[PDB]
Structure formats: C-alpha cells, structure tokens
C-alpha cells in the first residue's frame, strides 16, 4: 500500500472550521489549490514466468500415508456449568455478558497442503472497537 | 491497494464549516482547485506465463492413502448447563447475554489442497465494532 | 483497490455548510473546481499463458484412497440446557440473549482440493456492528 490513513474524527484536505460563540466578522479569503498526482503502482514486466509441480513414482510401494493439512481441531471439549441457587434474594444482574469463542474478523488466506504463488497479496483491516458500553 | 482512509465523522476535500452560536458577517471567499490524477495500477507485462500439474506413476502400488485439507475440526463438545433455581426471590436481568460461537466477518480464501496462482491477492475490511450498549 | 474511504456521518467534496444559531449575512462566494481523473487499473499484456493438469497412470494398483478437501466438520455436539425453577419469584428479562453459531458475513473464495489460477481476486468488506442496544 501507499497511503493508509487512521483518523479519529475529522479529515479535511481545507478546511476553515468555526466553533460555535465566534463572531465570524470582516474576513476576506482568497485560496488557490494546484494539486497533481502520479500513481503508478504495481508494475510488472516479465518476459517469461515458469511455474510447475511434477511428480514422479516408480515402482514404489507406498502405505500408511496420512497428510493432514494446517488448522487442524481435534478433541474439544467446552464445559461451562452455572449452577445459581437462591434462598429469598435480590438479584440485580444489570450489564453482565457470558461469551464463549466469539470471533470478530477471521481472514484465512493462502492456507494449503502444497502451493505456488507469484504476485501481490495484501490485508488491511480497520475498525472501532468497542465490546461493552453500559451505564 | 493506494489510499485507504479512515475517518469517524467527516471526510470533507474542502470544507467552510460553520458551528451553531456563530454570527458570520462580511465574508468574501474566494477558491479555486485544480486536481489532476494519474492512477496506473496492476499492469503486467509478460511475454509467456506458463503452468501446470504433471504427475506420473508407473508400477507402483498404493495403499493407506489418506490426505485431509485444512480447516479440520473433529469431536467437538460444547455442554452449556443454566441450572437457576429460585425460592422466593425478585430476578432483575436487565441487560445481560449468553452467546456462543459467534462471528462477525469470516473471509476464506485459496483454501486448498494442491494450489498454482499467479496475480494479485488482497483484502479489504473496514468496520465499526460494538457489541454491546445498554443503559 | 485504489481508494477506499470509511466515514461515519459526511462525505463531501465541497461543503459550504453551516449549523443552527448562525447569521448568515454579507456572504460573497465565488468558486471554480477543475477535476480531471485517470484510473487505467488492471491491465493484462500477455502473448501466451497456458494451464494444465496432466496425470497419468501405468500398470499401477491403487488401494484405500481417500481425498477429503478442506472445511471438514465431523461429529459436533452442542448441549445446552436451560433449567429454570420458580417459588413464588418476580422475574424480570428484559434484554436478555441466547445465540448459538450466529454468523454475519461469511465469504468462501477459491475453496478446492486442486486449483489452478491467473488473475486478480479481491474482497471488500465494510459495515458497521451493533449486536445489542437497549434502554
Ligand atoms: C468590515 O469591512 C467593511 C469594508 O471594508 C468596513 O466598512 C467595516 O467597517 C468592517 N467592519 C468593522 C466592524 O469595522
Ligand atoms: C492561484 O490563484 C491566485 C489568486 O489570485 C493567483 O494569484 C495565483 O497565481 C494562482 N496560482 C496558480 C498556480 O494558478
Ligand atoms: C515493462 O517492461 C517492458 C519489457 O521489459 C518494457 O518494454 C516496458 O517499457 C516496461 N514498462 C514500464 C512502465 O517500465
Ligand atoms: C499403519 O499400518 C498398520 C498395519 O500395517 C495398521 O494397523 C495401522 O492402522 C496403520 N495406521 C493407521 C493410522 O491407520
Ligand atoms: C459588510 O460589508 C459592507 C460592504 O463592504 C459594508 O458596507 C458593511 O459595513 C460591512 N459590515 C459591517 C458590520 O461593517
Ligand atoms: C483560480 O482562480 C483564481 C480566481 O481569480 C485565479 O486568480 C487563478 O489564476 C485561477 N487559477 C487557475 C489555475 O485556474
Ligand atoms: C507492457 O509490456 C509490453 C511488452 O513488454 C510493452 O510493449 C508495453 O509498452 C508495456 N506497457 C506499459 C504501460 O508499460
Ligand atoms: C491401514 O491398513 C490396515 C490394513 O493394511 C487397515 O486395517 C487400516 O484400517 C488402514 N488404516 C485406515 C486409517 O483405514
Ligand atoms: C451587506 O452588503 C450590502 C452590499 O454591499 C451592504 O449595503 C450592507 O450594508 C451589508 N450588510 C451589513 C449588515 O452591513
Ligand atoms: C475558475 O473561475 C474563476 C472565476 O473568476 C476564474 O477566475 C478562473 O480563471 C477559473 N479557472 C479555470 C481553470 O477555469
Ligand atoms: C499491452 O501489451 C501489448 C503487447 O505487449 C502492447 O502492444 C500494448 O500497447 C499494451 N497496452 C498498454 C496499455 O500498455
Ligand atoms: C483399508 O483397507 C482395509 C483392508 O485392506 C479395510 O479393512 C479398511 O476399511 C480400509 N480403510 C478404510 C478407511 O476403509
């Protein structure tokens, strides 16, 4: 990437802001912008790209293979009890949460047993986060 | 990718922004922009791009083959009792949540076995986030 | 991508803008904007790209093969019991939850056991989350 930009509130390539109570009086502006931009991204000059997977067997005996690849899960076990008793009470359970495996954002990429791969791979992410607001 | 941008309220190129209680008397604004934009992205230039899978088995002899991708799961147990039990009480759950295996954004890509790729790969994901508000 | 923008309330190019509470008088605009723009994005210069799979087999004996591709879910158990026992009680739900696997967006790409790909391939996500709101 080139340019990435994390702002809070306000972008503004000109700006003439004004809070509130000015007197705003006798003001002459006079404003000239000039502006030229080059991109020239990603560029690529190849003459030849190669690209194979060759395999070969002779007269071989193969047995037991097992290939397993990445992100493998075996054998999970959640146990989560809430056993509440009460005996003449008050409950006043206001902002209370009970979360368990809870993903936001999950990008899986270029996940594979056997790979060949030329060119460009690129992730941005951006956000607010803000898991619990309570008053 | 070039120009990512994040802002939380106002994107604004030129802005005479005025508040409220503001008395804006006797202005005299003047402005002239001149923008210009070159944008030359993901150019190739290849004379030959060549691929492929070749396998080859001769008087071979196979047994107990077994190949699994990624992303496996297995056995997976989730067990959530809630046992509330109650003699004479005042319950008062305003605001409260039980969530499990919960996702917002999942974005699978070249998820594979055997894999041959040439280019560009890129992701994206903006957001804003917030789980819970309660007052 | 080239240019991706996330803002929360106002995109504007050119704002003359103005709140409550203001006294507009006397106001001499005079404004010229020259926008020109080049987008020359994804260009392909290729004399030949070629793609294949080849396999061949000779005199060979094959046993107990299995393939299995990615996103493999096996033997999933969710147990949630809810017991809930009363005596004379004053229960008061008022923004309660239960979620089980909820999912919001879920994109699969390019998801095989074998793959054979040339080109560009992109993902753009934007949003904005709010699981819970209650007053
Ligand atoms: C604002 O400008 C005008 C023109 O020049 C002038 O007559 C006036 O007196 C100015 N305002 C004040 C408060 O002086
Ligand atoms: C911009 O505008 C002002 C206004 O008078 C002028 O003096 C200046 O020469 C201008 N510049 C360009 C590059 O156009
Ligand atoms: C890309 O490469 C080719 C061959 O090498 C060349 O002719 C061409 O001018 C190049 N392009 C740029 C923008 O440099
Ligand atoms: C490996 O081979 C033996 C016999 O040759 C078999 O009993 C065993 O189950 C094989 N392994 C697996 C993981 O299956
Ligand atoms: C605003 O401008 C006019 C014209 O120049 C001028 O007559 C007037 O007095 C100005 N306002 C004030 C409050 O001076
Ligand atoms: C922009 O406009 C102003 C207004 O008078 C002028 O002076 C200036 O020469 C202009 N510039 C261009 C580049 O057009
Ligand atoms: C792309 O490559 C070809 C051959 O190398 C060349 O003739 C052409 O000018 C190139 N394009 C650019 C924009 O550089
Ligand atoms: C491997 O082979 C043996 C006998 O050769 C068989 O009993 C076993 O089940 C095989 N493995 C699997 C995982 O099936
Ligand atoms: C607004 O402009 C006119 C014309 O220039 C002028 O006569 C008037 O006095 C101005 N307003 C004030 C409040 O001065
Ligand atoms: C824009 O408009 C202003 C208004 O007078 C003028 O002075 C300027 O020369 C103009 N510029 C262009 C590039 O048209
Ligand atoms: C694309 O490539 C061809 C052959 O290399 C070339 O003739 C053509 O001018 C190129 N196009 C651009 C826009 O560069
Ligand atoms: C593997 O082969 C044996 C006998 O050769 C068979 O009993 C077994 O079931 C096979 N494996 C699977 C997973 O079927």
Same mark, same amino acid.
């Given at each position: ?10 972008? $503004? ?9 000015? #007197? ?21 000059? #190849?003459? $030849? ?10 007269? $071989? ?14 054998? #999970? ?13 008050? +409950? ?15 990008? +899986? +990429? ?26």
């Amino acid at each position: 990437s080139i340019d990435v930009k994390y702002i809070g509130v306000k972008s $503004a390539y000109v700006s003439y802001d004004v809070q509130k109570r000015t #007197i705003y009086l006798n003001i002459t502006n006079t404003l000239n912008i000039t502006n030229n931009n080059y991109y020239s991204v990603e560029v690529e000059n #190849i003459t $030849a790209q190669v690209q194979f997977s060759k395999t070969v067997i002779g007269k $071989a005996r193969l047995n037991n293979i097992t290939i397993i690849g990445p992100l493998d899960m075996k054998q #999970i076990d959640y146990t989560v009890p809430t056993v509440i008793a009460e005996e003449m009470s008050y +409950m006043y359970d206001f902002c209370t949460l009970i979360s368990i495996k809870v993903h936001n954002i999950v990008l +899986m +990429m270029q996940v594979t047993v056997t790979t060949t791969y030329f060119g460009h791979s690129e992730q941005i992410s951006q956000e607010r986060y803000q898991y619990v607001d309570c008053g």
